Amino acid sequence: MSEQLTDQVLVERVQKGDQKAFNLLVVRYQHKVASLVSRYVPSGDVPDVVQEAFIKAYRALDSFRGDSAFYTWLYRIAVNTAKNYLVAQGRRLELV
DNA sequence: TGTCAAA
Protein backbone atom coordinates (compact mmCIF):
# COMPACT_ATOMS: atom_id res chain seq x y z
CA MET A 1 0.00 0.00 0.00
CA SER A 2 2.50 2.64 1.21
CA GLU A 3 5.98 2.91 2.75
CA GLN A 4 8.25 5.52 4.39
CA LEU A 5 12.05 5.78 4.66
CA THR A 6 12.20 5.31 8.45
CA ASP A 7 15.31 3.96 10.19
CA GLN A 8 13.64 0.53 9.89
CA VAL A 9 14.07 0.34 6.10
CA LEU A 10 17.44 2.10 6.21
CA VAL A 11 18.99 -0.29 8.77
CA GLU A 12 17.78 -3.34 6.81
CA ARG A 13 19.20 -1.77 3.63
CA VAL A 14 22.67 -1.56 5.24
CA GLN A 15 22.41 -5.26 6.18
CA LYS A 16 22.02 -5.87 2.42
CA GLY A 17 25.58 -4.50 2.10
CA ASP A 18 24.64 -0.97 0.96
CA GLN A 19 27.29 1.41 2.35
CA LYS A 20 25.66 4.51 0.81
CA ALA A 21 22.48 3.76 2.78
CA PHE A 22 24.61 3.97 5.93
CA ASN A 23 25.91 7.39 4.87
CA LEU A 24 22.34 8.73 4.94
CA LEU A 25 21.91 7.02 8.33
CA VAL A 26 24.98 8.92 9.59
CA VAL A 27 23.59 12.25 8.31
CA ARG A 28 20.31 11.39 10.09
CA TYR A 29 21.89 11.12 13.57
CA GLN A 30 25.19 13.04 13.28
CA HIS A 31 23.71 16.11 15.03
CA LYS A 32 21.78 14.07 17.63
CA VAL A 33 24.76 11.89 18.59
CA ALA A 34 27.04 14.95 18.77
CA SER A 35 24.67 16.31 21.45
CA LEU A 36 25.01 13.01 23.36
CA VAL A 37 28.81 12.61 23.29
CA SER A 38 29.41 16.32 24.03
CA ARG A 39 28.24 15.39 27.56
CA TYR A 40 31.43 13.30 28.03
CA VAL A 41 34.02 15.09 25.83
CA PRO A 42 34.88 18.75 25.04
CA SER A 43 33.82 20.23 21.68
CA GLY A 44 37.38 19.67 20.38
CA ASP A 45 36.87 15.87 20.53
CA VAL A 46 33.14 15.62 19.69
CA PRO A 47 33.54 15.22 15.88
CA ASP A 48 36.25 12.57 16.39
CA VAL A 49 34.23 10.59 18.97
CA VAL A 50 31.07 10.83 16.84
CA GLN A 51 32.91 9.50 13.79
CA GLU A 52 34.23 6.56 15.83
CA ALA A 53 30.69 5.86 17.09
CA PHE A 54 29.29 5.46 13.54
CA ILE A 55 32.20 3.31 12.33
CA LYS A 56 31.76 1.01 15.36
CA ALA A 57 28.04 0.84 14.56
CA TYR A 58 28.74 0.23 10.85
CA ARG A 59 30.50 -3.09 11.52
CA ALA A 60 28.26 -4.02 14.48
CA LEU A 61 24.90 -3.22 12.79
CA ASP A 62 25.12 -6.64 11.09
CA SER A 63 24.54 -7.98 14.64
CA PHE A 64 21.62 -5.63 15.41
CA ARG A 65 18.62 -7.67 16.62
CA GLY A 66 15.94 -4.96 16.41
CA ASP A 67 15.02 -5.55 20.07
CA SER A 68 14.42 -1.77 20.27
CA ALA A 69 14.33 1.36 18.07
CA PHE A 70 17.60 2.13 16.26
CA TYR A 71 18.43 5.22 18.35
CA THR A 72 18.13 3.20 21.58
CA TRP A 73 20.99 1.02 20.33
CA LEU A 74 22.92 3.96 18.83
CA TYR A 75 22.68 5.81 22.16
CA ARG A 76 24.36 2.94 24.05
CA ILE A 77 27.23 2.77 21.54
CA ALA A 78 27.73 6.55 21.48
CA VAL A 79 27.99 6.99 25.26
CA ASN A 80 30.28 3.95 25.54
CA THR A 81 32.45 5.22 22.65
CA ALA A 82 32.88 8.59 24.39
CA LYS A 83 33.51 6.92 27.77
CA ASN A 84 35.95 4.39 26.27
CA TYR A 85 37.89 7.41 24.93
CA LEU A 86 38.26 8.88 28.44
CA VAL A 87 39.83 5.63 29.73
CA ALA A 88 41.98 5.19 26.61
CA GLN A 89 43.89 8.31 27.72
CA GLY A 90 43.47 7.88 31.51
CA ARG A 91 45.35 4.54 31.42
CA ARG A 92 48.62 6.33 30.48
CA LEU A 93 49.93 5.34 33.95
CA GLU A 94 47.88 2.13 34.47
CA LEU A 95 49.34 0.16 31.52
CA VAL A 96 53.04 1.12 31.78
C1' DT B 1 33.59 -7.53 23.51
C1' DG B 2 28.94 -5.47 23.24
C1' DT B 3 26.07 -1.94 23.25
C1' DC B 4 18.79 -3.47 21.54
C1' DA B 5 12.94 0.65 26.38
C1' DA B 6 11.83 4.97 25.07
C1' DA B 7 15.43 9.03 23.76
Residue numbers of the domain that contains A94:
1-96
Residues within 7 Å (Cβ) of strand B: A 56-57, 60, 63-69, 71-73, 75-77, 80-81, 84
Elucidation technique: NMR
SS3 per residue for chain A: CCCCCCHHHHHHHHCCCCHHHHHHHHHHHHHHHHHHHCCCCCCCCHHHHHHHHHHHHHCCHHHCCCCCCHHHHHHHHHHHHHHHHHHHHHCCCCCC
Question: Gap from A85 CA to B2 C1', in Å?
Answer: 16
- Closest of A45, A10, A29 to residue A77, by C-alpha: A29
Chain B footprint bases within 7 A of protein beta carbons: 2-7
CATH number for the domain including A74? 1.10.1740.10
Number of domains within chain A: 1
Residue at minimal CA–C1' distance from B7? A72
